[PDB]
Structures are given as structure tokens and as C-alpha cells.
Paper text:
NS5A is a 447 amino acid phosphoprotein of 56/58 kDa implicated in a variety of roles from the replication of HCV RNA, the modulation of the host cell responses and the assembly of viral particles. The pivotal role of NS5A in virus replication makes it an ideal target for inhibition.
The zinc-binding motif has the same coordination as the genotype 1b NS5A Domain 1 with an average distance of 2.24 Å between coordinating sulphurs and the zinc atom. The arrangement and proximity of residues Cys 142 and Cys 190 in our model and the presence of electron density in between the residues suggests the formation of a disulphide bridge, despite the presence of DTT in the crystallization buffer, with a distance between the sulfur atoms of 2.0 Å, 2.0 Å, 2.0 Å, and 2.5 Å in monomers A, B, C, and D, respectively. Dimer AB displays a similar interface to that previously reported, but one of the monomer's orientation is reversed creating a head-to-tail conformation [Fig. 3(A)], rather than head-to-head. Residues 74 to 78 from each molecule appear to form an intermolecular anti-parallel β-sheet through an extension of β-strand B3 from Val 75 to Arg 78 [Fig. 4(B)].
Residue numbers in the entry:
A (entry chain B): 6 to 162
B (entry chain A): 6 to 142, 144 to 148, 151 to 163
C (entry chain D): 6 to 165
D (entry chain C): 7 to 163
Amino acid sequence: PFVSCQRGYRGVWRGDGIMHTRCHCGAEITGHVKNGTMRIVGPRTCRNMWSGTFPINAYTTGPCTPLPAPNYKFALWRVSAEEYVEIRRVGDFHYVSGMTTDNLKCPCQIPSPEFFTELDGVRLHRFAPPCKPLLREEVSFRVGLHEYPVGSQLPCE
Amino acid sequence: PFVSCQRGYRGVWRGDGIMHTRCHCGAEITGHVKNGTMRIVGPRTCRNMWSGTFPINAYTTGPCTPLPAPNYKFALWRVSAEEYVEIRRVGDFHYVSGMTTDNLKCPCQIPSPEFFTELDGVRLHRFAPPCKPLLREVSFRVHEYPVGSQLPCEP
Amino acid sequence: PFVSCQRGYRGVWRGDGIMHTRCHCGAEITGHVKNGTMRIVGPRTCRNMWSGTFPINAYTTGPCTPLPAPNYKFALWRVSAEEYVEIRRVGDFHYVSGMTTDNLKCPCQIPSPEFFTELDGVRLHRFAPPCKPLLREEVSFRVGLHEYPVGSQLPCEPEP
Amino acid sequence: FVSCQRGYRGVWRGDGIMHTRCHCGAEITGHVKNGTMRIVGPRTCRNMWSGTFPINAYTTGPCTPLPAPNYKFALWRVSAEEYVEIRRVGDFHYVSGMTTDNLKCPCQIPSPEFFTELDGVRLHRFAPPCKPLLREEVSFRVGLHEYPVGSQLPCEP
Ligand SMILES: [Zn+2]
Ligand SMILES: [Zn+2]
Ligand SMILES: [Zn+2]
Ligand SMILES: [Zn+2]
């Protein structure tokens, strides 16, 4: 139900200061982070203004970083320079629900939330590739050396 | 010998935990971070182990983040999906000494050291697309301005 | 393959100039200090030359002195005419966790980083006795008229 | 590091201490004893870690290189500003290219140390910039007879 006009991040921020981004509709949204809460200033027209959110793009600019909560439902993870992995979170456990390419080597511990490229459709980092179609069945990812099938939890929790 | 190993980063880190990476020479380097300091562990073969340094790669794994000292000489700023700028620092001012392409749009204010792609030869991000020859002979656009000029929101 | 390199100092120096020394593997290293920073030049053989570090032997030469950072773990303090004491440093507090001989006479104010003969395996001063084996258990050191056990803080140092 | 001028580690004639500077601009020193040169360098200059010695208008000392005759291509200054490439075949030499057409040439290929370059590696100082790299449809003048691009050095049996 988001019209992008891209889906903004709304949550805590790392650092204090003034942030600057441009939406896909054209808006320039300005953010004022102080004590880790950002106050948004934007045009009635952008959905992000309505949602209190702040889209992240090649256009983003300022000293601050997203500090999202660990209770996401899906996370796209940049593993190669051009390859990603979809993690699904269920309880305190995270399971590889998909991957751009097969035999995709990957780390075994899950990262802190702010290293993920996208959380539930929301971008976290100013630059990244596009995302090849996430294969979700009939596949395997290598973790170091021992391979696993799709759906299988990350081996370190 | 010394020659193929990536010039690693040595300095303060953000967040505690265990860092993993692989040097171009093939060596694996491990960094243990507590209170911002990283202790380096690696094979004798590799420079970074002797240098106390950590090579940031597409191979780097971990929770910690580099926190560079603001007192650099030169820095690489990724200002576009595929475009960079060399920023040279003199005292409290910084002067844009290079650019991969002429007339690239630019930001009027320098970022925190940590947002720079490379510092004095040390790459700080793990994913960084390659840098075409830097041009030091044209102009940039913030208005529009010749090479060597300070950052226009630094006057 | 692996040189027996006695590890060098890398850090800030006192007094600009040109310094020469010989390494344990007989690499005539030479350094150039300007504004505290020394730039090293030697052979691709020595492993100080992989770290970029200056070995301090009794071979060193020149008007510069090391100025080490204060956050060491273990230091070597030269007492006497032939005796040392390993000082172990925990945060702001300092313990006499070794010695080269029992019941050593031993001052109780722990010196500036500059004054230690060796800091965490790096010598700082050109001339030194060879260190005897470090007795670390069932021994004591005298701070003046008082006698204390191995593992004790310094007796000037405010320890609670 | 990658900007450094490829130097020479081979045998030297004479003994003593040699100085020169790289294009990177760390200076270099070689110590020659029994014909072997030891490289003392800045922990910045590839020629130090390569044990090589960059030969430049900046070199000084009392010693002269002696390359082994098992080179591939070489540079031969035949005039004040005119060189000639020479390809070794495992046999006897071949003139692989000039810098100017109808160039005059001595028929005997000289000992390895008279060449300005052996394989992209300078051996002499003050040698003039090479021009172009010309390959074909051109002739050289050995004695009074003339020869095509590609022929053996005449005086070789
Ligand atoms: Zn919008
Ligand atoms: Zn290495
Ligand atoms: Zn050595
Ligand atoms: Zn060089």
C-alpha cells in the first residue's frame, strides 16, 4: 500500500545532525536528528510526509545512520558484490528464505540490523545493486564448506 | 612478500565483537574489538598481521564499523553510483583535488570521515565500485567550480 | 623464511633527526624523524621492515628518543646495576608482577612511559643488561623499609 | 606502490654502494659485494620488495649491470635518437622493429649491457624518449645492403 514515492525508514538514528534526501516523486525531504529522533520537513504531496518516513537513496546526505529494531519480518542481505539473500525472522531465529543465485556462499552469524540492505521493503543504505529474482525453492547455500537447502536456519544460533 | 597485501586500517572501531576478513594475498585476518580497539590476528605471511592492520573487503564479515581520525591528507568520496572525488585536507579546510568525471554534481559539505570510501589509501567500506582515472587538470557543480576550489559551504 | 627479529618501536619520537641502527638479523635499518614521525628505510629481509619499526639495540645512533603511549600491559623497569622488575598495569593501577631476584629494592612511584627499558616487548633504551628469568611466584620486593608480596600494587599508588 | 619504475635485479659489474630514486620517489640504495646487489629502500617502493634497482637519470655509484643473455626483446640505440627492438629466438637475433624507416645498423648484436632496455627495464641513464612502435613495411640498412622488418641480424650464421 505504498506508492513510491519510495518507502521511507522511520526509527532511531545514529548521530545527531541534519539529513537530506530526494523521493522518487521529486520531493526533497529534510531530517533533523537530535537525541536520535529525526523530525521530518517535506511537501504535502510526498507520501513520506504523511507517513513520517524518510526514503534512502543515492541522493541521501548527512552525518546520520539508521538504527532499526531487530523485529523485522524479512531482510534482503548483501553477500556478494551483486548477490543478496532473503532472511525471514520467526521468534529469536532467522532462516534463509531465499537467494539471488544458487550455491551462494554466506556468513553464518546474522548481522546487526543496520547492515541489512532492506528491511520489510525499506532501504537502509544509500547505494546498492538492483535485486535479481529471489529463488526460494530447489536451491542450496554454502556456509563456509557444508551446504544447506533453502529454508534452513543460519548455522550459528 | 609485502607487496600484494591490502593496506589495512588501523584505528578506532565502533561497537564491540569479532571481525573477519581476507587479504588479497590470501591470508585470513581476524580482528577482536573491545571498547573501540581492535587486536589483530593473522598468519605471519601477511603484512597486515605485522602492521596491526585490517584489510576491508567484499570478504569482510562482522558487527564493527571503522571510525577514522579527521586528520587525513587525502580522501575518496563516492558521490554517485559510479562517481568519486578526491578531497585534499589542509588544516580546518578541505579542497577538492580530483574527480573521476568532469562537471559531476557535488555536496557542499564534507561528511564524517567514516562515510568516505577510502582514506589515505585505506578502503573503509566493503563494497566500492572501481575508480576511473581521477582528473586534476575541469570543474564540478555544487553553481559551478574549477578543480582545486574549497567546498563552497566551507567559506 | 622467518627472521629472528627483535621487535622494534613504532610511535612518536623526541627531537627531529636521522637515526641508524642494526637489527637482530643484521639489517642496517635507518629512520628519519620529522615532527615526531620516523620514516623507516632498510632491507626487504627484516621484519621490522614489514611492521615499519625501529629496533633499539646498543647499535642505535642519533638525537631522538621514543615517546610511548601510556596504555601498556607489561613494562620492564631497570632498578639496580643488573636487576629488573616487570610492572603489570591494570587500567589506572600498577602491580609489581615479577622481578629478576627476590627482595629487590624498588621505588614506589611508577615512572613515565619514557623511563621503562622495555614496554610490551619493545626495548626503548640503547643500553641494557640482558634480563634474567622473571620470578613470578613465592617472592617479595622491598619498597624502602617495608617488604611486600609479588602481585602487590605500588605503595605510593592510591589503591582501594 | 603500483606506480614504480621496474628495476633490475641481476648481476653487477664492480663493487660498492649505489644510489638512485624511483618514479614513486622513495630513494633506493644497492650494496654490491661479489657481484650481487642488496636493496635498501622505503617500505613504500615496490622496487625494494622486489629486490630490483630502478635505473634513472638519478642513479649514481661505481657499478655496471650485466644481464644474462636469455632475454626476449631488447632496445638498441643505434643513433642519437633512434632505437631498434631486437627479438631473441633462442638462436640468433632478429630485428623486430625500428623507430624510423631505412635505419642504419651494425650487424653484430652486442653484449647484453649495451642495450638501453631489456624487457621494459632500463639499464642506462639519459637515453632519449622512444617514439611509436612501428611493426611493418619498413627496411633497415646493414652495411650497404638493405633488409626487411623481420630478418636475422646479418652477421649471425
Ligand atoms: Zn515522494
Ligand atoms: Zn596479506
Ligand atoms: Zn631483522
Ligand atoms: Zn618505487
